[PDB]
């Protein structure tokens, strides 16, 4: 079924376009819009816990857009609730981290944060310089790929739809969706002469490690200074918060 695979491509790309938060052309056009030294100092002088509150809410919103992305993938809603949650819990943050490279400018090592670009020194008050370096380095490695929007869409669909996540109840069902998405992805890369990015994708385990460190830090902050979540997905909220 040739056009069926081209269908799933069009349905993944449309779900991505509807949930990607900012258009790539907006992010690229804003690259010259950079925080001043005075603006950077204002961020650096904020409380740890205020910068935590800002970052936690940006990350919560980002996760919620990823959940909406997943929900709009043909086949995801047909999975059982348990498996939907298993996949989102394990992979939604991984997708957020991947999505970050669109907002990263490798020319000057800045990210688009709250309306302008700035470097990692913007986040000094968080006292997480190791994790922030690891996030910036990761986005720096991905930015070298010059990911197109469809490549990020199909790749992040596969970050989510991974039949190897422990605890799946209907594994064959997740496998079917996974194989169809893998075919869609490989067909698209062939069509665009972009198969060369396959060897350049992050090693399996690299994204897992960075996300587990990231989520562990967020859980520590949340334990010390809980934020109020505008909760839209009760079964998933219940798995992350306590
Ligand atoms: O609207 C809903 O109902 C809703 C919204 C977000 C949800 O979780 C966000 C999240 C966080 C996070 C974030 Cl973003 C910010 C602060 C603290 C955490 C913590 F404490 F959980 F670590 N970290 O990891 C995830 C995650 C990984 N996979 N899925 C989610 C869940 C449900």
Swiss-Prot record:
It is found in: Nucleus. Isoform 1 is widely expressed in many tissues, including liver and adipose, and highly expressed in skeletal muscle. Isoform 2 is primarily expressed in immature thymocytes. Changing residue 132 to N: Nearly abolishes transcriptional activity. Residues 4-242 form the NR LBD domain. Induction: Up-regulated in the state of obesity. A motif (AF-2) lies at residues 236-241. Changing residue 62 to F: Completely abolishes transcriptional activity. Belongs to the nuclear hormone receptor family. NR1 subfamily. The AF-2 (activation function-2) motif is required for recruiting coregulators containing LXXLL motifs such as NCOA1 and NCOA2. Nuclear receptor that binds DNA as a monomer to ROR response elements (RORE) containing a single core motif half-site 5'-AGGTCA-3' preceded by a short A-T-rich sequence. Key regulator of cellular differentiation, immunity, peripheral circadian rhythm as well as lipid, steroid, xenobiotics and glucose metabolism. Considered to have intrinsic transcriptional activity, have some natural ligands like oxysterols that act as agonists (25-hydroxycholesterol) or inverse agonists (7-oxygenated sterols), enhancing or repressing the transcriptional activity, respectively. Interacts (via AF-2 motif) with the coactivator NCOA2 (via LXXLL motif). Interacts with the corepressor NCOR1. Interacts with CRY1. Interacts (via AF-2 motif) with the coactivators NCOA1 and PPARGC1A (via LXXLL motif). Interacts (via AF-2 motif) with PROX1. Interacts with FOXP3. Interacts with NR0B2. It is linked to Immunodeficiency 42: An autosomal recessive primary immunodeficiency characterized by increased susceptibility to concomitant candidiasis and mycobacteriosis. Candidiasis is characterized by persistent and/or recurrent infections of the skin, nails and mucous membranes caused by organisms of the genus Candida. Mycobacteriosis is characterized by infections caused by moderately virulent mycobacterial species, such as Bacillus Calmette-Guerin (BCG) vaccine, environmental non-tuberculous mycobacteria, and by the more virulent Mycobacterium tuberculosis. This is Nuclear receptor ROR-gamma. The gene is RORC. The chain holds residues 266 to 507 of 518 of the full protein.
């Amino acid at each position: 079924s040739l056009t069926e695979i081209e269908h799933l491509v069009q349905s993944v790309c449309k779900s991505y376009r509807e949930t990607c938060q900012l258009r790539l052309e907006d992010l690229l056009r804003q690259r010259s819009n950079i925080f001043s030294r005075e603006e950077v100092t204002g961020y650096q002088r904020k409380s740890m816990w205020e910068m935590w509150e800002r970052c936690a809410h940006h990350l919560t919103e980002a996760i919620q857009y990823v959940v909406e992305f997943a929900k709009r993938l043909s086949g995801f809603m047909e999975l059982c609730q348990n498996d939907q949650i298993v996949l989102l819990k394990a992979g939604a943050m991984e997708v957020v981290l991947v999505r970050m490279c669109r907002a990263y400018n490798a020319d000057n090592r800045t990210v688009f944060f709250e309306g302008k670009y700035g470097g990692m020194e913007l986040f000094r008050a968080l006292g997480c310089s190791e994790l922030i370096s690891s996030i910036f380095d990761f986005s720096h490695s991905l930015s070298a790929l010059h990911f197109s929007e469809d490549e990020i869409a199909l790749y992040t669909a596969l970050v989510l739809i991974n039949a190897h996540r422990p605890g799946l109840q209907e594994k064959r069902k997740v496998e079917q969706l996974q194989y169809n998405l893998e075919l869609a992805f490989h067909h698209h890369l062939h069509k665009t002469h972009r198969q060369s990015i396959l060897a350049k994708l992050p090693p399996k385990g690299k994204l897992r490690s960075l996300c587990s460190q990231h989520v562990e830090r967020l859980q520590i902050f949340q334990h010390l200074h809980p934020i109020v979540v505008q909760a839209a997905f009760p079964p998933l909220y219940k798995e992350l918060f306590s």
